[PDB]
Structures are given as structure tokens and as C-alpha cells.
Amino acid sequence: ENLYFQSMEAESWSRIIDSKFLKQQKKDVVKRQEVIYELMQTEFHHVRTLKIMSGVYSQGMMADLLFEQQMVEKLFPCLDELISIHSQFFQRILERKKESLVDKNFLIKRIGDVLVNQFSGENAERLKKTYGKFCGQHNQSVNYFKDLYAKDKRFQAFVKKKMSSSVVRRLGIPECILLVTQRITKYPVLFQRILQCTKDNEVEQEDLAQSLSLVKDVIGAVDSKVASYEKKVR
């Protein structure tokens, strides 16, 4: 789905965190809705970061500097895939908000099934391969970027032009790569905060516990892949 539409759905969600409707629910509900918000908002930022990497930097290198498709895969491996995964994950979350209206005021009573789906079966396998690759090529790409900046004056001009743009916050390529690398390790924390906020709901508590166990398996797999890559690079 479209990024502006995604941002409007996010901005809409956040209006309800500030609302009097929410602030006048029970403390445990306010806290639970506040943590589920955090998961959504940070997933939106992740998707935004990825699409800036792709639409601004990656597309710009090919269009302006005549980089090949392969030189860009060196800097940003599996970027198209990541964008697909996280936009879709982000959609599922919004789709859940849309069916959680009350009596425009909503209250997410159930998000565990969405998380379990995302981190099991072939979705989990896609994340493992995707991040294992991105997180493995991680340090080579940052060095490759820094190598290019110091050497190629045309890339140097390109980067300064981009950082000045209103589109990129002041997101440098190194920062982008670093943010994307971290992301997968954020989920256990966000998921576990939702779980400990969830009271008197058995289905949800079970699914959240499951998703938390599941995302740790993915992280493990990614860490094995990264370790092996680095050993091979030497």
C-alpha cells in the first residue's frame, strides 16, 4: 500500500492516544493500547526508512550516477523484499484497527494472531533469509559507502545534495543501514510489553507468548547467518 495513505492511517491512530476517550479508560487498558500504538508507529518509521533508502538513495544512484542493479544490491541487499514484508505486516496491523471500532474510537483487544502469523511458517523463513543477508552484508556496505564518499567526487556531490533534501530527514546511508539492522531486535521488547499489559484474556496471552518465542528463533537464525558470513569474509 501507499506510503502517504500509510502515514495518514498512522497519524489517525496517534490522534486517539492523545484523546479523552482513551485517557478515560482503565489504567491497564490505556497502557496496553499505548504499547500497541508504539509497535505500529515504529513499524511505520521502519517502512518509511526502507522506502527512503529505495526511492531516494537507491533509485538515485541508478538514475543519476549510473550504478548497476548489482552495485545497489551490494549497498542495500534484499531491500525490495524488506519493503514488501514490512508494508504487508504494517497493513495487517491497520486491518486489525479497522475491525476494532467501539459502539472515531477504537480499542485493539486482539493483536497476537497478527504477530504469530508474521513470525511463523514461510513468513518467518523469509525474514531469516532477508535479514541474515542484510545484517551480514551490513558492515561491508557502510564501509563501501564511506569508501565511495572519500574517493568518488560525483558520489560525494550526490550524497550532499540528498542529505539537504526535505525528503530525507538528515538520514545518511550509514544511519539507514544501522536502523534497518537493529529493527528485528526491537520486536521482542515491544511484544513482551504488550504481553505484560494483557490481563484476563487467555487466547491473546497465549499468542503473545508464542510470538515472543517465535521472534527469538528468527533472531537466533539471523545471528548464525551473520556469524558465518563474517567468518567467510575472513
Residue numbers in the entry: 1968 to 2070, 2074 to 2204
Extract from the study:
To investigate whether for our constructs the AKAP-Lbc PH domain contributes to catalysis of nucleotide exchange on RhoA we cloned an expression construct containing just the DH domain (residues 1976–2211, terminating at the end of αI) for comparison with the combined DH–PH domain. To analyse conformational changes in the DH domain on binding we crystallized the DH domain alone in the absence of RhoA, revealing a significant movement of the GEF switch region, which adopts an α-helical conformation with Trp1980 itself binding in a different pocket on the first DH domain α-helix. This we refer to as the inactive conformation, in which the position occupied by Trp1980 in the active conformation is now occupied by Ile1984 and Ile1983. In this inactive conformation, the critical Glu2001 can no longer bind to RhoA. We cannot rule out that the inactive α-helical conformation is induced by the N-terminal protein tag which is at the start of this α-helix. However, we note that the region around Trp1980 is weakly predicted to be α-helical by the PsiPred server, suggesting that a conformational exchange in and out of an α-helix induced by the absence or presence of RhoA is a realistic model. In contrast with AKAP-Lbc, in the structure of p115-RhoGEF in the absence of RhoA, the GEF switch maintains an active conformation.
AKAP-Lbc (also known as AKAP13) is a member of the A-kinase-anchoring proteins. AKAP-Lbc exists as at least three splice variants, however, all contain a conserved RhoGEF (Rho GTPase guanine-nucleotide-exchange factor) domain. RhoGEF domains decrease the affinity of a Rho GTPase for GDP so that GTP, present in higher concentrations in the cell, can bind. RhoGEF domains are composed of a DH (Dbl-homologous) domain followed by a PH (pleckstrin homology) domain.
